[PDB]
Write a protein that binds this ligand. Structure first.
Ligand code: ACO
Length: 174
């Protein structure tokens, strides 16, 4: 970026929401960051359009955890979503689990443990176990990621594009 990232983000992991409320012509600096991060994740995921942007973060109830170091390394975006989830008895149930919506580590530093670092921090602040999560179209990398770090192995295939794991049916999800 053309800005003092460390001045804007003093902390290693910055937690932001619909209010890009800085840790205001730098609340616009936050925007440019979210906007570029989202496009980078799109290119990495072979998406024609980003699923993360400033315009959209403002229009939703999503939380982004931005990772920096001592230059933005990556991010993970989460949110609670009303999903009507298929169980093992072909029954659909309304739940509101915490969902992983976007997740990106810059290519140069992928597979250095930064994903886990960002993921553990999110799990701690959100106070959730990995098996309570629903994931929006997990990539092959994310599936191996989740299996190594948390022993997550896919359960009942959904008809929506979310994926849940063995253990999901244990919480009430509000
Ligand atoms: C819900 C969503 O947002 S879906 C899409 C998820 N995002 C993407 O696929 C974008 C590109 N990928 C990435 O940004 C990151 O790989 C994720 C996917 C963000 C992983 O972040 P990382 O920081 O690389 O992971 P970290 O080093 O913490 O963990 C490594 C583990 O993740 C998996 N992993 C990461 N990259 C790869 C790869 N190219 N091939 C296979 N497994 C991989 C493996 O389990 C690996 O463990 P191993 O090296 O012992 O096999």
């Amino acid at each position: 970026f053309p800005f003092d990232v460390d001045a804007l983000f003093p902390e290693r992991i910055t937690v932001l929401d619909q209010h890009l409320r800085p840790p205001v012509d730098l609340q616009q600096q936050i925007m440019t960051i979210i906007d570029e991060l989202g496009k980078a994740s799109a290119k990495a995921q072979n998406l024609s359009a980003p699923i993360t942007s400033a315009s959209r973060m403002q229009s939703n109830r999503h939380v982004v955890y931005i990772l920096k170091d001592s230059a933005i390394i990556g991010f993970i975006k989460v949110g609670y979503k009303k999903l009507f989830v298929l169980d093992d008895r072909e029954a659909h149930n309304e739940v509101e689990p915490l969902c992983i919506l976007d997740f990106y580590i810059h290519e140069s530093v992928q597979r250095h443990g930064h994903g886990r670092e960002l993921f553990q921090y999110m799990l701690q602040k959100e106070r959730v176990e990995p098996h309570q999560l629903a994931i929006d179209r997990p990539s092959q990398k994310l599936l191996k990621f989740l299996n190594k770090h948390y022993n997550l192995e896919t359960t009942v295939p959904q008809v929506n594009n979310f994926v849940i794991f063995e253990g999901f049916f244990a919480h009430q999800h509000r």
